[PDB]
Amino acid sequence: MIKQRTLKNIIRATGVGLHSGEKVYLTLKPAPVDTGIVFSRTDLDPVVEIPARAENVGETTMSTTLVKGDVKVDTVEHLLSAMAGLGIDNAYVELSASEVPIMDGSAGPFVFLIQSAGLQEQEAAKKFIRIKREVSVEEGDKRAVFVPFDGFKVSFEIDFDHPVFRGRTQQASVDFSSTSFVKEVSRARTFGFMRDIEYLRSQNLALGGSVENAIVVDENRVLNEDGLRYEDEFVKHKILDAIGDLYLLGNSLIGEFRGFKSGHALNNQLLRTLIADKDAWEVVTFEDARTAPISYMRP
Ligand SMILES: COc1ccc(-c2ccc3c(c2)CN(CC[C@](C)(C(=O)NO)S(C)(=O)=O)C3=O)c(F)c1
Ligand SMILES: [Zn+2]
Numbered sequence: 606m607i608k609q610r611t612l613k614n615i616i617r618a619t620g621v622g623l624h625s626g627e628k629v630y631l632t633l634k635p636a637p638v639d640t641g642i643v644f645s646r647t648d649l650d651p652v653v654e655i656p657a658r659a660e661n662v663g664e665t666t667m668s669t670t671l672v673k674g675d676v677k678v679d680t681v682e683h684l685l686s687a688m689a690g691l692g693i694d695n696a697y698v699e700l701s702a703s704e705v706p707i708m709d710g711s712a713g714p715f716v717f718l719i720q721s722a723g724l725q726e727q728e729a730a731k732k733f734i735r736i737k738r739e740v741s742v743e744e745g746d747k748r749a750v751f752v753p754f755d756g757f758k759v760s761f762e763i764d765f766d767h768p769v770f771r772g773r774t775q776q777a778s779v780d781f782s783s784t785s786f787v788k789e790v791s792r793a794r795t796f797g798f799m800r801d802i803e804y805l806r807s808q809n810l811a812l813g814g815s816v817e818n819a820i821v822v823d824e825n826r827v828l829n830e831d832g833l834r835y836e837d838e839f840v841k842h843k844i845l846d847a848i849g850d851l852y853l854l855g856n857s858l859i860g861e862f863r864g865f866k867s868g869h870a871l872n873n874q875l876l877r878t879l880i881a882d883k884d885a886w887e888v889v890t891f892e893d894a895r896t897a898p899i900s901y902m903r904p
Contacts, residue, residue: 607731607891609694610904611635613723618714620706623680623795623819624668626812629702633719636695638729641855642688644671644678647699657685657698659853659876665869667810669850679704682869683795686849687715690786691724692857692901694731710794710818711834712845716787724904730890733899736860738885742874747866749875751885754861756782756898761843761864767798768825775840781848784902790848792834793841796820799828847872854879859889859898 616633636643642657653676655661663672668680684698684705690712698705708714740751760778763770779789797811797819805811815821820838821828835841847864850872864872879886891897 607894607897607899607901608726609638609729609731610692610724610901611637611695611727612693612719613725616718616722618706618708618718620708621813621818622702622704623707623710623813624810625679625702625704627702627704629700629704629706631706632697632699633722634697634699635725636697638695638727640695640697642685642693642695642852643697644681645697645699646676646678646703648701649676656855657681657688657853658855659873659880662853662873665873667805667869669853669869669873677703680707681705682846682849683707683710683712684715684849685852686845687712687719687791689848689852689857690781690791691716691719692731693719693724694856695727704813707795707813707818710796710820711792711842712790712849713792716791720787726904730892732856732888732890733859734854734856734879734886735889736858736879736886738882740875740879740882740885742871742878744871744874747868747871748864749867749871750861750863751858751875751879752861752863754859756780757858757860758782759844759847759862759864761840761847761867763840763843764866767822769822769827770839771836775837777837777840777844779844782898783900786848787902790841790845793838793845794818794820794834795842796822796839798822799824843867851876856888857899
C-alpha cells in the first residue's frame with residue numbers, strides 16, 4: 606500500500622517571523638497515524654494545539670493564519686508546502702511564538718532539515734482527497750479551481766503591472782504525481798515591494814522581512830545582490846503557497862489546482878467550498894503503490 610509518513614527524528618530550527626520579526630524556536634516531532642499536522646504554541650501555559658485544517662484558518666490577509674480563540678499560528682503556508690511536497694501525513698510542529706520562522710523565504714531549508722532527519726513509513730494506508738467534480742471560486746478578478754486529474758498537478762498565473770515580470774505574464778504548470786516538488790518549487794522564495802514596505806511595517810506586517818528571506822522588488826529591479834533562483838521564481842512561489850494552503854484539507858490531493866491571481870484568502874474559500882460539496886470529492890487509499898497515480902521519494 607502507499608503508507609502514511611512521519612518524521613524519523615525530531616528537527617529543531619531557530620528563525621524569525623516574516624511579519625512579526627519575533628525570534629521563534631521550531632521543533633517538528635513524529636506523530637501517530639492519522640494525527641495530521643498539528644501546530645503547538647509551547648510558549649503558552651497550558652500549551653495550545655491547532656490542527657492544520659481549513660476550519661482553523663482565521664486571517665488570510667498577508668499569510669495563512671491558524672486560530673484558536675485569541676491564540677494564532679501565523680504564516681504556516683511554506684512549512685505546510687514542505688510537509689505536503691514530501692508526503693508527511695503526521696507531525697507535531699511546536700513554536701515558541703505566534704509565527705513560523707520564514708528561513709530564506711522558501712521551503713528549501715525545511716525540506717533540507719526534514720530530509721536530513723529522514724521519514725518513517727507507518728503501518729496505515731495514506732489517505733488522499735480525490736477531486737470528483739470541478740469546484741471553482743471567484744472574488745471578481747481572481748479564480749481558484751479544483752479539476753479531476755489522475756495525479757497531482759498545479760497551474761498558476763499571476764499578472765502584476767510591474768516591469769520586473771519580464772514584460773511576459775509569468776504562468777507555470779507542474780505535475781507532482783512523481784517527485785518534481787523539491788527540484789521545481791521547493792526553493793522559490795516569497796517576494797514583496799519597496800513601494801509597500803513602510804505602510805505594511807505601520808500595520809506591524811513584514812517586520813522580519815529582508816533580502817535574506819525575500820525577493821525585494823524596487824520600481825524596476827529585484828534588489829537582491831544574487832537575483833533569482835529561477836526565471837519564474839515568482840509564479841513558482843505562488844505554486845509553493847497553493848500546495849501548503851491546499852494541505853489544510855488534511856490529506857494529499859488527487860486532482861488539479863488552477864490559480865488565477867489567487868492568494869491565501871481565495872485558496873481557503875476554495876477548500877471550504879470543496880469540503881461543503883461532498884459529491885465533489887471522496888477519500889481514497891491505495892493497497893498497491895504500483896497502480897496509484899501518485900508516487901513518493903524513497904523514505
Ligand atoms: C527589505 O525590503 C523589503 C520590502 C518588502 C518586503 C516584503 C513586503 C511584503 C511581503 C513580503 C516581503 C513577503 N510577503 C508574503 C508574500 C505572499 C503573501 C506569500 O508568499 N505568502 O506565502 S504572496 C507572494 O502570496 O503575496 C509579503 O506580503 C520585505 F520583506 C523587505
Ligand atoms: Zn509564500
